[PDB]
Amino acid sequence: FSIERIIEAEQRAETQCGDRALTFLRVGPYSTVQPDYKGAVSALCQVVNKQLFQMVEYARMMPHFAQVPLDDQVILLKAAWIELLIANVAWCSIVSLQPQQLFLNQSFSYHRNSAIKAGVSAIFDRILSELSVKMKRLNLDRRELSCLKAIILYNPDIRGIKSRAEIEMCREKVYACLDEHCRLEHPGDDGRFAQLLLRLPALRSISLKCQDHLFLFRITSDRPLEELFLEQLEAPPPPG
Amino acid sequence: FSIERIIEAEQRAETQCGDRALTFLRVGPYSTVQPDYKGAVSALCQVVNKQLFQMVEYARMMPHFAQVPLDDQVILLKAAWIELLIANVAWCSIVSLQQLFLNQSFSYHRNSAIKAGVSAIFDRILSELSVKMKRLNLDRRELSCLKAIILYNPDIRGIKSRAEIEMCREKVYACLDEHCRLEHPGDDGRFAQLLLRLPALRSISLKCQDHLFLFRITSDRPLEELFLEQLEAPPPPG
Amino acid sequence: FSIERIIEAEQRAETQCGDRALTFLRVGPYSTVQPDYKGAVSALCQVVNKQLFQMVEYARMMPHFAQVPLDDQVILLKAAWIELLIANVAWCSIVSLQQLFLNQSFSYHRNSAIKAGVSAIFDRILSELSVKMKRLNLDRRELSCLKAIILYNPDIRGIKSRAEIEMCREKVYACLDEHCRLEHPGDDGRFAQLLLRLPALRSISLKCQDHLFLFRITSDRPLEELFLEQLEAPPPPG
Numbered sequence: 192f193s194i195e196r197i198i199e200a201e202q203r204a205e206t207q208c209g210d211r212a213l214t215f216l217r218v219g220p221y222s223t224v225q226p227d228y229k230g231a232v233s234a235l236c237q238v239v240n241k242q243l244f245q246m247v248e249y250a251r252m253m254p255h256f257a258q259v260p261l262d263d264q265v266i267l268l269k270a271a272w273i274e275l276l277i278a279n280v281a282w283c284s285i286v287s288l289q290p291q292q293l294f295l296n297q298s299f300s301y302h303r304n305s306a307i308k309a310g311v312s313a314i315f316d317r318i319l320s321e322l323s324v325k326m327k328r329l330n331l332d333r334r335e336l337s338c339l340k341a342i343i344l345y346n347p348d349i350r351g352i353k354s355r356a357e358i359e360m361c362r363e364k365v366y367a368c369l370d371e372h373c374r375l376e377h378p379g380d381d382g383r384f385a386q387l388l389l390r391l392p393a394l395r396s397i398s399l400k401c402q403d404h405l406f407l408f409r410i411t412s413d414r415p416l417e418e419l420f421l422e423q424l425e426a427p428p429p430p431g
Numbered sequence: 432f433s434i435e436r437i438i439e440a441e442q443r444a445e446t447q448c449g450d451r452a453l454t455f456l457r458v459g460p461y462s463t464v465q466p467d468y469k470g471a472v473s474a475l476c477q478v479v480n481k482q483l484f485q486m487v488e489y490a491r492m493m494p495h496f497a498q499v500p501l502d503d504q505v506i507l508l509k510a511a512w513i514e515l516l517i518a519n520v521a522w523c524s525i526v527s528l529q530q531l532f533l534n535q536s537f538s539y540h541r542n543s544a545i546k547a548g549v550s551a552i553f554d555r556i557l558s559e560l561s562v563k564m565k566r567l568n569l570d571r572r573e574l575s576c577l578k579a580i581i582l583y584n585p586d587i588r589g590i591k592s593r594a595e596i597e598m599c600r601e602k603v604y605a606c607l608d609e610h611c612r613l614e615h616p617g618d619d620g621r622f623a624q625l626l627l628r629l630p631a632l633r634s635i636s637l638k639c640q641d642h643l644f645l646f647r648i649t650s651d652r653p654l655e656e657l658f659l660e661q662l663e664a665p666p667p668p669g
Numbered sequence: 670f671s672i673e674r675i676i677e678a679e680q681r682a683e684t685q686c687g688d689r690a691l692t693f694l695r696v697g698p699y700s701t702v703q704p705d706y707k708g709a710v711s712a713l714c715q716v717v718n719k720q721l722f723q724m725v726e727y728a729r730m731m732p733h734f735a736q737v738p739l740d741d742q743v744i745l746l747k748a749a750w751i752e753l754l755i756a757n758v759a760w761c762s763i764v765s766l767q768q769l770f771l772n773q774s775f776s777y778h779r780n781s782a783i784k785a786g787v788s789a790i791f792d793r794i795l796s797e798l799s800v801k802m803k804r805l806n807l808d809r810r811e812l813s814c815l816k817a818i819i820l821y822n823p824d825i826r827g828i829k830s831r832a833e834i835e836m837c838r839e840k841v842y843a844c845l846d847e848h849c850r851l852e853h854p855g856d857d858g859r860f861a862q863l864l865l866r867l868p869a870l871r872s873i874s875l876k877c878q879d880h881l882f883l884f885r886i887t888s889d890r891p892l893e894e895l896f897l898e899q900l901e902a903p904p905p906p907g
């Protein structure tokens with residue numbers, strides 16, 4: 192249970208899944224998307240569906256995750272998926288830093304004119320101003336982002352969860368890891384640890400608006416995400 | 432901490448205590464019992480008092496139970512005893528499937544409960560527990576898990592080591608779920624369904640307790656003391 | 670994580686820090702203190718500032734204390750310090766059973782407290798803590814357990830690692846229970862009685878705080894900072 196073990200999970204999940212994807216997003220005949228922009232939106236859907244698949248395998252390799260009861264595993268993923276994805280876009284969008292580019296990967300990105308065009312420039316802006324900019328301003332490193340993402344995953348306050356204690360414990364061990372990293376690498380500002388945590392509330396708020404947009408444009412599967420997560424979990428991992 | 436380490440505790444407690452008994456149930460002079468049946472009721476008392484003694488030795492062997500302060504060990508037993516006993520009878524009565532078993536031999540017929548007024552309890556034990564357990568194909572490992580979950584209860588007033596107790600319960604959850612994923616690849620809803628029996632066990636168990644303080648067949652000494660005394664004492668064989 | 674481990678921390682922190690101090694108490698220019706009584710009060714300040722330094726090193730050595738985030742470490746020390754100091758004076762003063770001891774040799778007579786206007790605190794420390802501890806035959810090892818229970822407080826606002834801290838407190842409970850029923854038999858109610866001293870300690874401790882602020886003999890710098898700075902620095906030889 193170390194930052195290194197958490198890093199390994201992220202990295203391996205990102206390279207061993209190939210093109211496998213959890214198809215939750217997709218444009219159907221009831222989507223509020225103009226016909227001329229279906230190709231574009233569906234491309235965005237394929238990207239997210241692949242990151243979702245990877246996310247599941249990521250959690251599968253996270254310390255203790257596979258041990259909590261399956262029902263708990265499903266709830267944890269349902270509660271943190273959007274925040275985990277947005278944290279990754281915030282980090283990839285640090286390369287080209289009012290910001291004009293939002294990266295989902297290293298080779299797939301949007302300019303602000305397209306957001307404005309799609310009518311989602313407000314969420315485009317706060318992602319870059321409230322997360323990317325402040326992370327850069329803080330000199331956030333890859334190790335600190337991994338810690339923040341784990342803190343998110345290990346959430347014991349979700350309704351319905353069985354193993355709250357076990358989950359809170361994992362979270363606290365990540366706190367300890369994060370603080371040590373702070374102590375070791377940034378002994379000069381004792382306020383760093385707290386500042387890094389301040390990004391979490393902004394991540395949650397932005398993440399909630401994203402979900403609202405998803406429901407509004409109706410590009411989600413009729414099948415409940417819970418089922419999709421449960422099915423991948425009950426299945427073996429890909430060749431990796 | 433494994434379904435098998437919990438199984439070992441139950442099994443050993445059931446065979447190594449002999450006829451040793453924790454005397455809580457008793458038929459005395461002030462007891463509201465039909466002298467025409469005092470013998471019968473006192474026989475029921477002896478059975479329960481032996482299962483109570485066994486229960487204490489069971490808990491003594493459960494992972495970490497003997498580590499929390501003694502006051503907490505006493506509170507845990509006082510809160511779970513009836514539910515633990517009734518879980519064992521519900522499991523046994525599955526065999527009959529109007530007969531309720533307390534042992535793998537000692538039983539009681541419907542017509543026996545209608546007499547003492549406890550026909551309601553009799554009915555729901557078989558109705559909500561035995562039948563549904565059978566219907567679910569409940570196995571011994573799962574009953575052991577349900578009973579452990581009951582024992583490790585952190586929400587009781589007065590408890591000191593809540594975190595440890597909860598941590599214990601959660602490890603049993605992890606064991607129960609695994610058992611499911613392995614011996615029931617299918618139905619992902621099994622785990623939760625099994626847990627649904629707990630509320631129905633608690634409710635029935637509370638009724639049984641109200642029907643005890645109503646027959647005056649309990650000791651003048653508070654059960655807490657009896658538990659404390661057996662705990663502060665050594666075990667029977669090993 | 671046993672009593673021997675907790676005792677070692679206290680003892681070593683008490684002898685390896687030499688004359689170092691964390692200057693939280695000072696007779697500043699804004700102290701409502703009368704000029705004539707400055708040397709005496711400042712002497713009291715130096716004593717407390719040395720015990721504060723030692724306290725930090727004590728915590729730094731306590732099981733798991735150092736791995737939780739600094740911020741939590743800071744909050745724990747800020748909430749516990751006064752109670753930890755007063756627990757030590759209660760124990761010391763036991764010898765005079767008149768006099769209130771801060772050390773095995775630093776002490777005050779009721780008259781001193783009389784003219785300083787703090788005879789109220791003076792009396793309940795000896796009365797509610799020292800006397801009752803003596804009356805209970807409280808031993809050093811046990812005083813260590815009570816002090817750990819105090820340190821490991823998970824209910825403070827702002828704390829991050831509540832679970833881990835609670836787990837630490839509960840392990841001390843088990844230690845205290847084990848010790849208590851082994852060296853002070855003849856009373857299963859001892860454990861609960863020993864814990865009753867905590868609320869008294871907290872109440873008295875809150876009043877002591879009130880006197881500090883009223884008089885204004887505290888540093889212009891927030892104690893949080895002073896704790897954070899000693900924690901972030903290396904320990905003395907130890």
Ligand SMILES: CCCCCCCCCCCCCCCC(=O)OC[C@H](COP(=O)(O)O)OC(=O)CCCCCCCCCCCCCCC
Pocket residue numbers: 223224225228231232235239273276277280293295301305306308309310311314315401402404405408
């Ligand atoms: C992985 C995290 C992704 C976060 C990215 C958010 C920034 C938004 C990106 C801009 C999208 C441009 C699409 C191009 C189509 C276009 O120009 O579209 C242009 C058209 C304009 O048509 P009109 O001008 O005629 O009304 O708009 C549409 O038809 C609506 C497009 C649907 C918008 C879907 C976008 C999803 C909403 C984002 C929040 C959900 C996050 C899900 C991840 C958890």
Ligand SMILES: CCCCCCCCCCCCCCCC(=O)OC[C@H](COP(=O)(O)O)OC(=O)CCCCCCCCCCCCCCC
Pocket residue numbers: 463464465466467468469471472475479513516517520531533539543544545546547548549552553639640642643646
């Ligand atoms: C192991 C848990 C036990 C769960 C209870 C299931 C057993 C129910 C069967 C009834 C018991 C037969 C007693 C004989 C009565 C009889 O024929 O005797 C018949 C008479 C009825 O009187 P009448 O002759 O006037 O109709 O009953 C009596 O003598 C009155 C005494 C009451 C009997 C005591 C019953 C105990 C209550 C059970 C609750 C125990 C739960 C607490 C432990 C967890």
Ligand SMILES: CCCCCCCCCCCCCCCC(=O)OC[C@H](COP(=O)(O)O)OC(=O)CCCCCCCCCCCCCCC
Pocket residue numbers: 701702703706709710713717750751752754755758769771777781782784785786787790791877878880881884
């Ligand atoms: C280590 C904990 C110590 C707690 C023991 C309390 C006993 C206090 C003994 C009195 C000290 C006598 C000094 C002689 C000077 C004098 O007569 O003092 C005389 C003057 C009175 O002035 P006047 O006579 O002009 O009204 O008093 C003062 O100057 C104000 C008193 C300041 C002393 C503060 C101590 C109060 C206790 C607060 C608790 C702080 C501990 C917190 C850490 C846990």
